[PDB]
Design an enzyme around this catalytic site. Structure first.
Site, short mmCIF file in Angstrom:
data_model
loop_
_atom_site.label_atom_id
_atom_site.label_comp_id
_atom_site.label_asym_id
_atom_site.label_seq_id
_atom_site.Cartn_x
_atom_site.Cartn_y
_atom_site.Cartn_z
N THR A 134 0.87 -1.21 0.00
CA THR A 134 0.00 0.00 0.00
C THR A 134 0.89 1.24 0.00
OG1 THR A 134 -1.89 -1.09 1.01
CG2 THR A 134 -1.76 1.30 1.31
N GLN A 135 0.58 2.20 -0.87
CA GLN A 135 1.37 3.45 -1.05
C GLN A 135 0.41 4.57 -1.45
OE1 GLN A 135 3.24 3.45 -5.13
NE2 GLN A 135 3.76 1.36 -4.53
N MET A 181 -0.74 -6.40 -2.69
CA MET A 181 -1.17 -5.14 -2.03
C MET A 181 -0.05 -4.09 -2.11
SD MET A 181 -4.29 -5.57 -1.05
CE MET A 181 -4.59 -4.22 0.09
N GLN A 239 -6.21 4.85 1.58
CA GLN A 239 -5.64 3.46 1.60
C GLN A 239 -6.03 2.75 0.30
OE1 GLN A 239 -6.44 -0.33 3.15
NE2 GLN A 239 -4.48 -0.25 2.08
#
Ligand code: MG
Lengths: 5, 233, 240, 244, 231, 222, 250, 211, 235
Positions: B1-2, B107, F1
């Site tokens: 995740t970024q 992810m 997110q």
């Protein structure tokens, strides 16, 4: 969404 | 995740009778619409494929290296590397499509929207899209970000269906693409005036045009616009 | 880890490490198993070259695996402890998952499986141990007696012996044990077991151990005086 | 490859013996004699130091007799270095049991586990076995005073009186001759020393060549004391029994 | 002699004896023939039986729609290497939407076989393979040997008395190479080739095994009554 | 997110006849209020007379169909080119789907073909692999619009025999391929009118003992 | 690839001998003589500096090593084996003691840890024993002064005085005659120099002899003041000059 | 809604056939009974996939036991295989309400309740699912140990019907099973649509309804 | 010594060839395939008369449609049977169908060569795998520790194999009934067995489409032994 009485 | 920091805006493309056209502006925008132009978002792979990338610039440069790396690898122990066993747009797209989906499944996605534009070995036009979710689709016209909202409607007037592709000439298609780029400049805050356009033609090969500028813009009417309703001066 | 294949085939098709494991068993003190009509008896030899022994604390030759199954053995004592521990753990594991104690056949099949695994695993030698596993299946009155050996083969026996001079005591049982009519009572079965050991042991003093297993987890070890009465009775009847 | 240089330490002879275990026992038979004698009211551990030098510091030395916990001691025969590896393992196992159950480890349980470690080195791993035989002298509330021995094979057995190391054959005959079941600790002390005095390869048995220890209930009311004898205390007990 | 204990030991003349012994397993194996034109590539295999009550050991394995091989030597090793080829053909399809080139198939088998000739503990593969395929550069025939040496050929044969069929194909080269757009005639040339490696025994209906791949022909194996035409 | 899932819209429909089965799907691919493609097929011939569609998140749908096609290929290799029966395919797909029970494929899956008695078969799956054989199933965006209509016109639900006081039900019977394609075409034109994510084109794959045939029909492009 | 040697290279012979340990002790016997003498108020350890070449700078090669401020070590046998054992010994004094109790280990316990490392090289896979014997001299509050020998087997013994290597048999006899329980540190240094002169053949001076003491605390060598409890290291290496001063009154 | 109860004539097992995705009725034709082996039954409540997959898996584990032990698995052993499995997955989000019902000579007729929390219970009467409360009310009121097989079958059918009516997430059709010494016997699929009116007419109940 | 996966100068694996010698020492096992079913028979060979012969399990069920007879170091077969049963059940779980006899055999043979320096040595046991499936009907396979398997109309393995195989060569035809095959296994077993054949020292089994895999009771086998003797005395 999914199935589930 | 970024979270993407520096991003590229829309990439627009369409098919014509003898090939495909793809274009992208040369700007890297920051979070609060700040600029950093001097970014080429069209990656030519061989002489039959151009890859147009939008989204995170850092991830784009990683994908650029993968494609350069891929060409090197294909040449290894390949006598027909420049002939029958040369990289195809379908091969390059499928590799990228595979990478995008396995990254999203870990992810840790590549925050990009990619359009692979090329001509196959049998002369068939190739146009297909892949994004950070690994979602893929093909159409006579393909565009990313703002281009999907504003460029696609203009390009679909020229080529609404598959049967319109043979009737569409490169002169018509290029005009449509160049007009669409101007509209994006008018209405997209993250667009720039400078853009690159690439044509892949089965008969004439790959033509790459850099340092193109938006021209014949309409601003004159702005002088007549005064206030926000009741102001007469 | 140490990976070497120690148990391997020879040109004649034998696995020498498994066969040399049987030799260790043949060196071991004699163990006999005799199953009657409503009981099984496990007789065990104790070599008499060891005086000043503390018989209270010295490891007993017959081991309870569960309340209803017992394991005797011939061969390397240290090796036997590893099979007994694994068997005892599996007995409690079976009760926990199947909500039922092991059958004698199942416990045997497990121990035989462990012995087999050590004949084609890298870095290990086979167990220098053969076992007699005896007892009664839960809610069952049919006596069970199984034998295992280093190779990992197991089978059921009416009566069987293992260890040093086992061929002599097997000879005795083969003519003295009737399939059609086994020892009807506990006394008869214990006597035939003691008789079979007296062919080999030397003296019937602190050299013979007897353990009697009966249905519904009824296992008891006989004392010196109790065993000594059987020895006194057999010797007086012999002189004829 | 490396197969060429592998001694195969964990294989059977055609006769069904373990080469490395048999050769380890041969090693131990050259080690200084250790005797354990169990009485009704305590246990004696006596051991002969291996050919002492005059300039060896005797008082602050530990070669033969080691403490495992407050209730269990061992007499060593073999490689001292190998013994210390096993002793530290046994000391930890004892404290693991105390931590788990809040009860001092029963003697047999500690012996079985230490014996099971030795067994492992003979069946797998391709390493040499531990060149060590132990005499375990201990007390618990179940079996009271207990003597055990373990050897490199991992086999262990219980004893009323036993010897390990050099001249065990001779030592075991003398113990078997003079031992009886209603024996006192003071009597067992005298037997242990007299036995070493006759089996020793030295000219005369002296305090400087001996390690000595008793496990008695000599402390006030139902508690066990471990006495590792000082040089001067060995000198005194050696005069009192009339060996010097 | 002293230098044949393992694959990690060179001989004083610079030979790998464990590899040479693996090569010997192939010579004991039943004969199989490979040949190709510009349009089609053919595998012909003489299957071997244990006795009259037994089945005939299958020699030909399909790897993809456009590629497969015939084996001579240890059949289980052919299964390991053919399974590896299936996975590499499959990887090429899934990742690159690309049919694996027959030349790359050869390179991958070579490199897999090589690792098993340089590491202690492992052994060389005890099987030879004839890989046929039709890819973007037309028809192809490869000869694999467990030394790792892979060779592209117009025709060849491996197994017992293979030299007979190999000599015939060397003579016939100019004829069978030009059998374009005629499958049956190219098989006939393959069957006449393997016939030069027969002694006492002849080709029967459940003895002969043929496979073919080409321009508009997926890799298909013919056994039983399907090969009766070519006897 | 980062959200790993998306909705590509589209709707699919499987109907089983006596000696045939159809699997239909619209050809429109969407994101939010944008049209990605007016012709992006999501109903696929998988070989062994099995047609498949994984409707929902297109990336997960493409991944599953790809993995199943591969499963068919390896079933041939490992079991002597044996034909994969529709019941065997259905069980295989359960394991593919349940394999990702804690990171599911956001797709509704329908496969169609013939059973081992040559009779029309349709299987439907939830995202995590629970499956059921059915005469009739709609999946995706406009499932709620199509499904009650099929209950009425295929299974004749709530229809009684005129004059029987609602005591005798309208009898069940197999529909012809011609009559089924009519219901499919009308189901999709109806769904096109009332669902914004449905339109552009309708692709029907028909499965008989003779093989897999295709039919294409235009839908409204608004 | 990889270490395939996971099996013991030291095994029991039919006679019960551990060959590789016996052969290691033979290597120690070939080694240059080193000795240790324990006084009432200190301990001395000494060895010859056998110089490989006269171009070599014998100062750089240190045969007598500080392990802790109160513990020193000398050896006979294979120098490289000693150097890595000193490194491992210094580290284990920290990892397995000082980082737990906040104080340096007592002599006997550090010796015990060195012994353990040498025992492992005797039983572990794919290794030979260490070809050295160590003499470890040390002081600690509760045991006072002590001197220990450690052998390739991993065995260790406490000594009043001893010698190891080339001329150990003769050196031990010399120490037996001279040693008493009333020796002051200066007396033990004097005896050490007398004992070592017998085993040395060539030049005998402060440049060819390496000698260290465990004695009184050295505040001057601590490097800081202000903490009364920290009084400085008991280990001191005697200088070339300090040795030559005691060779005049010999 | 699923129930299983023990009586003189063996075990009665009754289930509905409805599957729901929120308020959407996904199906009315689902088989909530797994047949495992001729003397073993499994009921499913909760996540459709979770129940379907793991109870199908349970049947495979039960077959292996019988191959390795030359004896059909016990109801206790079968139930504990499933309960030990779900306990491994505890906290991962499995949703399953389950009843393992069978006869063996050594146990007799046995019912085990097993849920995804890891609870394993032996009992004479169980009702599992959203409509369990509606079924319980009918069952408890008319339950007798000495019920006839014909009456027991009807009570199970009637108890599901009661739940199908009052509960929004139960309905479609009633599936009936009877388990004896000779094994389990299917007593057919009864559509609630036809069943409700027949029951109302014959029994003279359902007086809240119009018609 | 020498490596476990070493090739001989002839091009065979030493350890595999040596395991084949172990299998020759094993008790006899015979299989016969017909259009009415497949018969499997074994020599029990008790080492002593006190050993309860019924506890000698050398014929084993893998699934309802697949049986197994073994010869050699029979302890080695336990993990091979465990794997076969798991494969058969696992395939039924994944594909809701019976697994092909060939596919089950291929699965067992994939263990065979998973040895070296995986397990320390090859298996010292051969298996006759008999079964039925819808595709290829009644099948008999011979699974060796080499990883090779052949299909057979009839096959003998163990001490009396070379003699028994020569007898099966003459006696087997494509029109054999199940009753004829049963008697033929019993006939050839009695010929190659050391001790005299009865219902206690020999065991019969068969696999039919209808009734699946069944190990014959001692009472049933006894009647077939009595029927066999009468027919041989009749001419
Ligand atoms: Mg619409």
């Amino acid at each position: 969404x999914f199935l589930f009485x | 995740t970024q979270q993407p920091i520096v991003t590229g805006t829309s990439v627009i493309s369409m098919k014509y009778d003898n090939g495909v056209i793809i274009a992208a502006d040369n700007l890297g925008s920051y979070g609060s619409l700040l600029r950093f132009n001097g970014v080429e978002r069209l990656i030519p792979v061989g002489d039959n494929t151009v890859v147009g990338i939008s989204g995170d610039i850092s991830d784009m440069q990683h994908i650029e290296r993968l494609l350069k790396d891929l060409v090197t690898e294909n040449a290894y122990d390949n006598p027909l590397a420049d002939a029958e066993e040369a990289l195809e747009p379908s091969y390059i797209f499928e590799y990228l499509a595979t990478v995008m989906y396995q990254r999203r499944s870990k992810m840790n996605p590549l925050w990009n929207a990619i359009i692979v534009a090329g001509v196959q070995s049998n002369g068939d036009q190739f146009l297909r899209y892949v994004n950070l979710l690994g979602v893929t689709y093909s159409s006579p016209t393909l565009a990313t970000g703002f281009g999907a909202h504003m460029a696609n409607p203009l390009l679909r007037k020229v080529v609404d269906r598959e049967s319109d592709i043979p009737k569409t000439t490169v002169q018509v298609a290029e005009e449509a693409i160049v007009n669409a780029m101007r509209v994006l400049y008018y209405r997209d805050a993250r667009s720039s005036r400078n853009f690159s356009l690439a044509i892949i033609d089965k008969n004439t090969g790959l033509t790459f045009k850099k340092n193109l500028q938006v021209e014949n813009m309409k601003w004159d009417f702005a002088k007549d616009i005064k206030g926000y309703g009741t102001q007469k001066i | 880890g140490y990976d070497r294949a120690l148990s391997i085939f020879s040109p004649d098709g034998h696995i020498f490490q498994v066969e040399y494991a049987l030799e260790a068993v043949k060196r071991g003190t004699c163990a006999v198993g005799v199953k009657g009509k409503n009981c099984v008896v496990l007789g065990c030899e104790r070599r008499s070259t060891l005086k000043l022994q503390d018989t209270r604390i010295t490891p007993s030759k017959v081991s309870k695996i569960d309340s209803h199954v017992v394991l005797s053995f011939s061969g390397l004592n240290a090796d036997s402890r590893i099979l007994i521990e694994k068997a005892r753990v599996e007995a409690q594991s079976h009760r926990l998952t199947l909500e039922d104690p092991v059958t004698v056949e199942y416990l045997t099949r497990y121990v035989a499986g462990v012995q087999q695994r050590y004949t084609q695993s890298g870095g290990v030698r086979p167990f220098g141990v053969s076992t007699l596993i005896a007892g009664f299946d839960p809610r069952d009155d049919e006596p069970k007696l199984y034998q295992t050996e280093p190779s990992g083969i197991y089978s059921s026996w009416s009566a069987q012996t293992i260890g040093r001079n086992s061929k002599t005591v097997r000879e005795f049982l083969e003519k003295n044990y009737d399939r059609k009519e086994p020892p009807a009572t506990v006394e008869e079965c214990v006597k035939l077991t003691v008789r079979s050991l007296l062919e080999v042991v030397q003296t019937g003093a602190k050299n013979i151990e007897i353990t009697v297993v009966k249905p519904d987890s009824d296992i008891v070890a006989l004392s010196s005086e109790e065993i000594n009465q059987y020895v006194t009775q057999i010797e007086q009847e012999k002189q004829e | 490859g490396s197969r060429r240089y592998d001694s195969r330490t964990t294989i059977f002879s055609p006769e069904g013996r373990l080469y490395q275990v048999e050769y380890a026992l041969e090693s131990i038979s050259h080690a200084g004699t250790a005797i354990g004698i169990m009485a009704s009211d305590g246990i004696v551990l006596a051991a002969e130091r291996k050919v002492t030098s005059t300039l060896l510091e005797q008082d602050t030395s530990t070669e033969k007799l080691y403490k495992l916990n407050d209730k269990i001691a061992v007499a060593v025969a073999g490689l001292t270095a190998d013994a210390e590896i096993l002793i530290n393992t046994a000391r930890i196992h004892a404290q693991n049991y105390l931590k788990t159950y809040n009860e001092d480890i029963p003697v047999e349980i500690l012996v079985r586990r230490l014996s099971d470690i030795k067994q492992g080195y003979t069946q797998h791993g391709g390493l040499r076995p531990f060149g060590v035989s132990f005499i375990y002298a201990g007390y618990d509330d179940r079996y009271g005073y207990q003597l055990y021995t373990s050897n490199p094979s991992g086999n262990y057995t219980g004893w009323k009186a036993i010897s390990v190391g050099a001249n065990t054959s001779a030592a075991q005959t003398l113990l078997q001759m003079d031992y009886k079941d209603d024996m006192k600790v003071d009597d067992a002390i005298e037997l242990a020393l007299k036995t070493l005095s006759k089996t020793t390869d030295s000219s005369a048995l002296t305090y400087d060549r001996l390690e000595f220890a008793t496990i008695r209930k000599g402390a006030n009311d139902g508690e066990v004391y471990q006495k590792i004898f000082k040089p001067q205390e060995i000198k005194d007990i050696l005069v009192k029994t009339g060996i010097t | 002699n002293n230098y044949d204990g393992d694959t990690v030991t060179f001989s004083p003349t610079g030979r790998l004896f464990q590899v040479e012994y693996a090569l010997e397993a192939i010579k004991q194996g039943s004969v199989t023939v490979g040949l190709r034109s510009n349009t089609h590539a053919v595998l012909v295999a003489l299957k071997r039986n244990a006795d009259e009550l037994s089945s005939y050991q299958k020699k030909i394995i399909k790897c993809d729609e456009h590629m497969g091989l015939s084996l001579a030597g240890l059949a289980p090793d052919a299964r390991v290497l053919s399974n590896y080829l299936r996975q590499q053909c499959n990887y090429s399809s899934l990742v690159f939407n690309r049919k694996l080139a027959v030349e790359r198939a050869g390179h991958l088998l070579c490199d897999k076989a090589q690792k098993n000739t340089q590491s202690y503990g492992g052994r060389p593969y005890g099987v030879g393979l004839l890989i046929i395929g039709y890819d973007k550069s037309g028809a192809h025939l490869l000869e694999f040997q467990p030394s790792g040496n892979v060779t592209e050929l117009y025709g060849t044969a491996i197994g017992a008395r293979s030299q007979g069929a190999k000599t015939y194909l060397e003579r016939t080269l100019d004829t069978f190479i030009k059998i374009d757009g005629n499958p049956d005639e190219l098989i006939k040339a393959g069957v006449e080739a393997i016939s030069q490696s027969l002694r006492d025994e002849s080709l029967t209906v459940d003895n002969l095994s043929i496979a073919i791949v080409g321009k508009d022909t997926p890799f298909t194996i013919y056994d039983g009554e399907a090969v009766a035409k070519y006897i | 997110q980062f959200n790993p899932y998306g909705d590509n819209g589209g709707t699919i429909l499987g109907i089983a006849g006596e000696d045939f089965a159809v699997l239909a799907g619209d050809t429109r691919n969407i994101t939010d209020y944008s049209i990605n493609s007016r012709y992006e097929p999501k109903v696929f011939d998988c070989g062994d007379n099995i047609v498949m569609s994984a409707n929902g998140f297109a990336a997960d749908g493409d991944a599953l169909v790809k993995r199943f096609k591969n499963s068919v290929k390896w079933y041939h290799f490992d079991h002597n080119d044996k034909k994969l029966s529709i019941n065997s395919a259905a069980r295989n797909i359960q394991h593919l789907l349940y394999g990702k029970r804690f990171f599911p494929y956001y797709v509704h899956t329908i496969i169609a073909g013939l059973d081992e008695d040559g009779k029309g078969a349709v299987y439907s799956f939830d995202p995590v692999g629970s499956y059921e054989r059915e005469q009739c199933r709609a999946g995706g965006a406009a499932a709620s619009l199509i499904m009650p209509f099929l209950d009425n016109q295929v299974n004749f639900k709530n229809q009684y025999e005129p004059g029987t006081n609602g005591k005798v039900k309208k009898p069940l019977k197999y529909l012809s391929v011609e009559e089924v394609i009519k219901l499919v075409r009308d189901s999709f034109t109806s769904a096109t009118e009332r669902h914004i994510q449905v339109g552009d084109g309708l692709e029907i794959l028909i499965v008989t003992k003779d093989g897999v045939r295709k039919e294409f029909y235009e839908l409204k492009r608004d | 690839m990889t270490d395939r040697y996971s099996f013991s290279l030291t095994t029991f012979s039919p006679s019960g001998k551990l060959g590789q340990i016996d052969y290691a002790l033979t290597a120690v016997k070939q080694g240059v003589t080193s000795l240790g003498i324990k006084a009432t108020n200190g301990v001395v350890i000494a060895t010859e500096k056998k110089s490989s070449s006269p171009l070599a700078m014998s100062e750089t090669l240190s045969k007598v090593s500080l392990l802790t401020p109160d513990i020193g070590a000398v050896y006979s046998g294979m120098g490289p084996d000693y150097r890595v054992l000193v490194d491992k010994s210094r580290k284990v004094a920290h990892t397995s003691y000082k980082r737990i109790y906040g104080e340096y280990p007592p002599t006997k316990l550090l010796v015990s840890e060195v012994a353990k490392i040498m025992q492992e090289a005797t039983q572990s896979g794919g290794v030979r024993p260490f070809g050295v014997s160590l003499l470890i001299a040390g002081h600690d509050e509760f045991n006072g002064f002590s001197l220990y020998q450690v052998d390739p087997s991993g065995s260790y013994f406490p000594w009043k005085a001893t010698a190891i290597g080339k001329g150990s048999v003769a050196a031990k006899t010399f120490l037996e005659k001279r040693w008493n329980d009333e020796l002051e540190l200066e007396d033990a240094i004097h005896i050490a120099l007398l004992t070592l002169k017998e085993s040395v053949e060539g030049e005998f001076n402060g440049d060819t002899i390496e000698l260290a003491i465990i004695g009184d605390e050295n505040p001057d060598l601590l490097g800081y003041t202000g903490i009364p409890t920290d009084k400085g290291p008991r280990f001191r290496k005697l200088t070339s000059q300090e040795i030559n001063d005691r060779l005049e009154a010999l | 809604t699923t129930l299983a109860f023990r009586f003189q004539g063996g075990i009665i097992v009754a289930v509905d056939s409805r599957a729901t995705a929120g308020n959407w009725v996904a199906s009315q034709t689902v088989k909530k009974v797994i047949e495992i082996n001729p003397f073993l039954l499994g009921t499913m409540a909760g996540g459709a996939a979770d129940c379907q997959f793991w109870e199908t898996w349970l049947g495979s584990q039960c077959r292996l036991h019988e191959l390795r032990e030359k004896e059909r698995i016990s109801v206790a052993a079968a139930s504990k295989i499933l309960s030990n499995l779900v306990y491994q997955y505890k906290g991962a989000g499995l949703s399953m309400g389950t009843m393992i019902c069978g006869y063996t000579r050594k146990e007799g007729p046995t019912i085990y309740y097993v849920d995804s929390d890891g609870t394993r219970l032996k009992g004479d009467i169980f009702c599992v699912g959203s409509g369990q409360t509606f079924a319980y009310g009918v069952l408890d009121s008319n339950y007798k140990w000495d019920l006839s097989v014909e009456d027991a079958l009807y009570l199970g059918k009637r108890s599901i019907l009661a739940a199908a009516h009052r509960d929004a997430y139960s309905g479609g059709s009633v599936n009936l099973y009877h388990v004896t010494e000779d094994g389990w016997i299917y007593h057919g699929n009864h559509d609630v649509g036809e069943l409700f009116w027949k029951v109302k007419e014959e029994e003279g109940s359902f007086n809240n309804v119009i018609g | 010594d020498r490596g476990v996966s070493t090739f001989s100068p002839e091009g065979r694996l030493f350890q595999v060839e040596y395991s084949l010698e172990a299998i020759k020492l094993g008790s006899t096992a015979i299989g016969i395939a017909t259009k009415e079913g497949v018969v499997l028979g074994v020599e029990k060979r008790a080492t002593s008369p006190l050993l309860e012969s019924d506890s000698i399990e050398k014929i084993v069920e893998i699934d309802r449609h697949i049986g197994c007879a073994m010869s050699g170091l029979t302890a080695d077969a336990r993990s091979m049977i465990e794997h076969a049963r798991t494969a058969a059940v696992t395939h039924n779980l994944y594909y809701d169908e019976d697994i092909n006899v060939e596919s089950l055999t291929q699965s067992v043979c994939d263990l065979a060569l998973r040895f070296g320096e995986l397990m320390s040595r090859p298996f010292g046991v051969a298996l006759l795998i008999a079964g039925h499936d819808a595709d290829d009907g009644y099948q008999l396979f011979h699974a060796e520790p080499s990883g090779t398997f052949y299909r057979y109309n009839a096959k003998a393995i163990g001490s009396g194999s070379e003699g028994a195989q020569a007898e099966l060569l003459n006696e087997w035809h494509s029109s054999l009934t199940l009753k004829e095959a049963e008697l033929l296994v019993l006939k050839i077993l009695k010929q190659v067995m050391e001790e005299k054949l009865d219902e206690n020292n020999a065991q019969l089994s068969c696999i039919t489409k209808q009734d699946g895999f069944k190990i014959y009771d001692n009472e049933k086998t006894a009647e077939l032994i009595k029927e066999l003797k009468e027919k041989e005395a009749a001419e």
